[PDB]
Amino acid sequence: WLEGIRKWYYNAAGFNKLGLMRDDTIYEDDDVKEAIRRLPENLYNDRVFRIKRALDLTMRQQILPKEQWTKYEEDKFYLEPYLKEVIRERKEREEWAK
Amino acid sequence: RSFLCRESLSGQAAGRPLVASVGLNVPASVR
Amino acid sequence: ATYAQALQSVPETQVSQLDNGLRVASEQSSQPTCTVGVWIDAGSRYENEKNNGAGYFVEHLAFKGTKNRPGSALEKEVESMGAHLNAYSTREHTAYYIKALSKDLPKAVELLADIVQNCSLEDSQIEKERDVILQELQENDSSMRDVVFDYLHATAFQGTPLAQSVEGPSENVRKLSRADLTEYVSQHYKAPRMVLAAAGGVEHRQLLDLAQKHFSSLSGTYVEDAVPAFTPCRFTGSEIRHRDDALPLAHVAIAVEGPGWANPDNVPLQVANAIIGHYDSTYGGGTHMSSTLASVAATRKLCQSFQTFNICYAETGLLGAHFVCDNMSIDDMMFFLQGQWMRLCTSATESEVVRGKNILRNALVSHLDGTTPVCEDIGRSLLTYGRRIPLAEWESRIAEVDASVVREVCSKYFYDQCPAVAGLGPIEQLPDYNRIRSGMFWLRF
Amino acid sequence: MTNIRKSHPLMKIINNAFIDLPAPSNISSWWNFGSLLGICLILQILTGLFLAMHYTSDTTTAFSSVTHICRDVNYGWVIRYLHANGASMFFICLFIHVGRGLYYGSYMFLETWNIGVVLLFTVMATAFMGYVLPWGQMSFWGATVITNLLSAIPYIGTDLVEWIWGGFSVDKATLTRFFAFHFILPFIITALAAVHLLFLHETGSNNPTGISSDMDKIPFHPYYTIKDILGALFMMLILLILVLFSPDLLGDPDNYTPANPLNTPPHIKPEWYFLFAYAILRSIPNKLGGVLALVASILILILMPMLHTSKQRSMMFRPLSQCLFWMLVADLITLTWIGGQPVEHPFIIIGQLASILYFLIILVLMPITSIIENNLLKW
Amino acid sequence: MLSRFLGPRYRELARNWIPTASMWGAVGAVGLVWATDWRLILDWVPYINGKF
Amino acid sequence: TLTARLYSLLFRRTSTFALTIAVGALFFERAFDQGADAIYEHINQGKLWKHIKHKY
Ligand code: HEM
Numbered sequence A: 001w002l003e004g005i006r007k008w009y010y011n012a013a014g015f016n017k018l019g020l021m022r023d024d025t026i027y028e029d030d031d032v033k034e035a036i037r038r039l040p041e042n043l044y045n046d047r048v049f050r051i052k053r054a055l056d057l058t059m060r061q062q063i064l065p066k067e068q069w070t071k072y073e074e075d076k077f078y079l080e081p082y083l084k085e086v087i088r089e090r091k092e093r094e095e096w097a098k
Numbered sequence B: 001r002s003f004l005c006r007e008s009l010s011g012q013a014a015g016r017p018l019v020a021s022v023g024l025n026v027p028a029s030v031r
Numbered sequence C: 001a002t003y004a005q006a007l008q009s010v011p012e013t014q015v016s017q018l019d020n021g022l023r024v025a026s027e028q029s030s031q032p033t034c035t036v037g038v039w040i041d042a043g044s045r046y047e048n049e050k051n052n053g054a055g056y057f058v059e060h061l062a063f064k065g066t067k068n069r070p071g072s073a074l075e076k077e078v079e080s081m082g083a084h085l086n087a088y089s090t091r092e093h094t095a096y097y098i099k100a101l102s103k104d105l106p107k108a109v110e111l112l113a114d115i116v117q118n119c120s121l122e123d124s125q126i127e128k129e130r131d132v133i134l135q136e137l138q139e140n141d142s143s144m145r146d147v148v149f150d151y152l153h154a155t156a157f158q159g160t161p162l163a164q165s166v167e168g169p170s171e172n173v174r175k176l177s178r179a180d181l182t183e184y185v186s187q188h189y190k191a192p193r194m195v196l197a198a199a200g201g202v203e204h205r206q207l208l209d210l211a212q213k214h215f216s217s218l219s220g221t222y223v224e225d226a227v228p229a230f231t232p233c234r235f236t237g238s239e240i241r242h243r244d245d246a247l248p249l250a251h252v253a254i255a256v257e258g259p260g261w262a263n264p265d266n267v268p269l270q271v272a273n274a275i276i277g278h279y280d281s282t283y284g285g286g287t288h289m290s291s292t293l294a295s296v297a298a299t300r301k302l303c304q305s306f307q308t309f310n311i312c313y314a315e316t317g318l319l320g321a322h323f324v325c326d327n328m329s330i331d332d333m334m335f336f337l338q339g340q341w342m343r344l345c346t347s348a349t350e351s352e353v354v355r356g357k358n359i360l361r362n363a364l365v366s367h368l369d370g371t372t373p374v375c376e377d378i379g380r381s382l383l384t385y386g387r388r389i390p391l392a393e394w395e396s397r398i399a400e401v402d403a404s405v406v407r408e409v410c411s412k413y414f415y416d417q418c419p420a421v422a423g424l425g426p427i428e429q430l431p432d433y434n435r436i437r438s439g440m441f442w443l444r445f
Numbered sequence D: 001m002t003n004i005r006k007s008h009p010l011m012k013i014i015n016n017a018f019i020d021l022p023a024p025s026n027i028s029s030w031w032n033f034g035s036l037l038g039i040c041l042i043l044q045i046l047t048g049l050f051l052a053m054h055y056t057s058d059t060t061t062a063f064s065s066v067t068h069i070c071r072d073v074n075y076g077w078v079i080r081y082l083h084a085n086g087a088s089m090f091f092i093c094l095f096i097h098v099g100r101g102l103y104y105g106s107y108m109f110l111e112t113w114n115i116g117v118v119l120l121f122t123v124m125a126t127a128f129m130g131y132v133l134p135w136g137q138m139s140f141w142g143a144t145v146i147t148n149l150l151s152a153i154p155y156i157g158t159d160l161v162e163w164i165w166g167g168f169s170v171d172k173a174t175l176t177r178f179f180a181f182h183f184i185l186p187f188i189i190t191a192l193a194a195v196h197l198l199f200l201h202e203t204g205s206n207n208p209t210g211i212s213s214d215m216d217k218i219p220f221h222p223y224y225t226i227k228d229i230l231g232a233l234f235m236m237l238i239l240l241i242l243v244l245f246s247p248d249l250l251g252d253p254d255n256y257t258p259a260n261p262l263n264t265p266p267h268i269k270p271e272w273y274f275l276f277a278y279a280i281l282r283s284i285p286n287k288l289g290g291v292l293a294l295v296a297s298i299l300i301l302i303l304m305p306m307l308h309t310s311k312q313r314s315m316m317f318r319p320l321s322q323c324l325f326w327m328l329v330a331d332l333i334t335l336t337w338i339g340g341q342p343v344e345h346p347f348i349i350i351g352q353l354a355s356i357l358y359f360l361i362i363l364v365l366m367p368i369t370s371i372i373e374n375n376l377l378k379w
Numbered sequence E: 001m002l003s004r005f006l007g008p009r010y011r012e013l014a015r016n017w018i019p020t021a022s023m024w025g026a027v028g029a030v031g032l033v034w035a036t037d038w039r040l041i042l043d044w045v046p047y048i049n050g051k052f
Numbered sequence F: 001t002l003t004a005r006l007y008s009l010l011f012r013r014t015s016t017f018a019l020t021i022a023v024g025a026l027f028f029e030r031a032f033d034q035g036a037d038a039i040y041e042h043i044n045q046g047k048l049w050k051h052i053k054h055k056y
């Protein structure tokens, strides 16, 4: 089933190994930077700590133990609610320029 | 904008309560 | 009731004229208040170098005393009825308007007749008024917008009476005696160049008979034969920079030669101007403002306040912008602002033209609200145009313009025309005149 | 008082360049190759000068002069073979740098990527012109073939090839022009590399993870200076192995023969680093199609920023894209192997398939894989 | 990009810049002909064909 | 004025300016080359090869 292949790919992706939440791995274009700026303080601080710890781990080429990996159902989508709004605003601006 | 004559000061003593006003296309005004 | 239907209603501007030549024009709608005033065709542009500032003196001394009304009795009568008497004098027109109730019309016209016909011009009051005008000059020195606009006129219309300031240099005000002022009154306050305009609860027949019974003594004869003639002016593309680094902000105004009063190209150009629009720091529109320059300024906090003007005299006028901003913002705006004009001269779109048309319609309708602005419109239009243009005609001319018309008129007036930059204050980054003139054309086009 | 390092304008530029430049702490060893390229460039220039001080540029006395460098100049063979093998090291580092840019999504830095493509073009041109200078059989015939390729250009082809030849074939004029351009070009490469670093510094380096490393930054000096020093030492070890033990490992023996225009080598091939494109042009039958595929094989790096469709910049978290990338690398090695081999069945079919698969991966398979990738992460 | 640039205002801008861009292309064509001394084109213009 | 007509017919647009410059150079090259060559041949009449090809 589709969710099975999604979970298998989540395991094979690798950013779960570095304790990295899904939205942390997104590329940072203008929409993404504006979305990150829009984040609340607690979420921003958690995001920056996760990114810094992952950068440390990749510099030392190690991953956290089996227990402290982000699971499939613990991988919340925190950036998505703001990113979708930013995308909608950009699309509205383009449609007005249309 | 200074004032050093009666004619310039004339009309500068407020006699009505202040009413702030700001728009979206018009600059802010007070009275 | 649609826009067009409401536009037609527009109570008319019934216009008449006495034997002397003083055109009487009124506009009755409903109100118990009415604004009545005369719009003489005096001003700085009719003043020579020696007597410049005579009009300002005459306006100052108008309300102080008359022959029939000894003095402060005039002010007592004006205040006792609740009338707010006021006056002003531009470079072209000078006007007095009693702004009072409808029932006080017979007395209001009488008061205006006394002021504009029998003025004491007392030497003692002249001497007391002399200090006040000098004080007013020190007042206006502080006002940066007024001085930058005076610099604009001085550097643009140099060598012509139009470049003269309305108040006058602070040397003529200390020498203008009764003789010069009396000549000004007897040579400019003439019946043909006067418009007795009233608006509100005013009856055209009532205004006509009041004018007949009061302003009959007005004459149109110009002394022996001395008839001051209108002198064409020469827009001289130049620049002036009064650099005073202690000033907080740098007022910079740049304009080119626009059209005259009668030129139809005024209607398109204003639309183009409405496309650029105007901005102040305390707006709140911010980044989402439709005008490109407004959004750029608000996004980067470039300026504090920019606005576009359409100063328009009889045969010529100024057309451009005036922006107040900090020291390290003058150049960038002069890049963006000009970047707008060239774009408007080459890439005008239907959407922005429609926006400008709507802005112009709204401005024309909103400005004509209240009895006093209507009186202003009648008085100014009977002199500049010779008739009061109804709102329906304005709507028709606005509907005529489109993107092609805007592009053509902007290319005619803006593209590759020498400007008249005039700065003030901490103007260091202000681009050199060659840079500005280069920016007045686009190499892609 | 001001610190001279941060106040003297020259030392200020050096400081902002590679003293206090904020660099990510987790950049892998694959970034060191960047410095290696510059190091190689510097080394090349030095050796080039010491080669230009004993090398005439005349057809009559070109090849012999080179022998005089190897047989007579005190410590001359070392300089000559140092140049010859440093060219190969330069191209190894260049290819690894391009691969690193493809993998970790460093091509998202658009201006640096385009400047790098220009640097690549210039480097291949310089190396090709350099290979002609020894005037061996391979140099002469390779120059002849490559310039004859330009005759396929419509209208202005024959005139262009005659003009570049300075005549009607590869001869004294062509050799002298090639020497002059080989001399000047590396300085243009140096200027372009300075521009490359300039454009890079306005955005900072990209870490393997792709995520912005602004929170975790370290000064360049105490760490990456010594890291690049170690990388340079390892590259020096490899290059010196090549020079001292098998100097002509990556070199066709036919080059050690005077360029005789009346006798072709039984097999004509470029140097190894030029085979990947060469085989590509061998795949296309049409003569102009060969030139177009040749130029596209390198110019397709321009489309990388536009063809990117995955929500993630890097490729550490894209397994399917990783298999695709390694398929592309294996295909490149396949083309390199095929190019040296003579045109004959089955190498014709394998070369055509390799070129087709290369273009298919670059333009089609990678973006489609990225689009499939996004759906698997609910975006 | 494939649809953001496809708009009525964008089409109008294209029409506005068609004369400028087209005669810029004419500028480039004439400059190329002059620089390369293209006989195939210059053989037709009078008083210039006398050069050859 | 002729100059004013030339300006606001063929000088206002910088692209029209470039086209004018291109055509002007096209004609000026021929005119200048012809004039200079004619002058130079006139100064050295009978001393160039082109003036003595007929003899041989
Ligand atoms: C003349 C040869 C070249 C030199 C000397 C050179 C120099 C450098 C250096 C020193 C760096 C920083 C270290 C690094 O990240 O590797 C760098 C980064 C980079 N170069 Fe090059 N380069 C060259 C060729 C190329 C080529 C051919 C490309 C691809 C077209 C390219 C694209 C890049 C990119 C994308 C980066 C940024 C990588 C990152 O930030 O992770 N360069 N270059």
Ligand code: HEM
Residues within 6 Å of the ligand: D041, D044, D045, D047, D048, D049, D050, D051, D052, D055, D066, D080, D083, D084, D087, D090, D123, D126, D127, D130, D131, D132, D133, D134, D182, D183, D186, D189
């Ligand atoms: C971009 C860096 C450079 C590269 C990649 C490069 C590449 C080459 C190559 C491949 C050869 C042929 C070697 C052989 O067949 O034996 C060569 C030869 C030569 N190069 Fe360079 N070169 C570079 C820089 C320079 C510079 C800067 C100079 C001048 C100072 C120079 C001067 C020479 C000379 C004189 C030869 C002929 C000697 C010989 O072939 O062994 N090179 N170069």
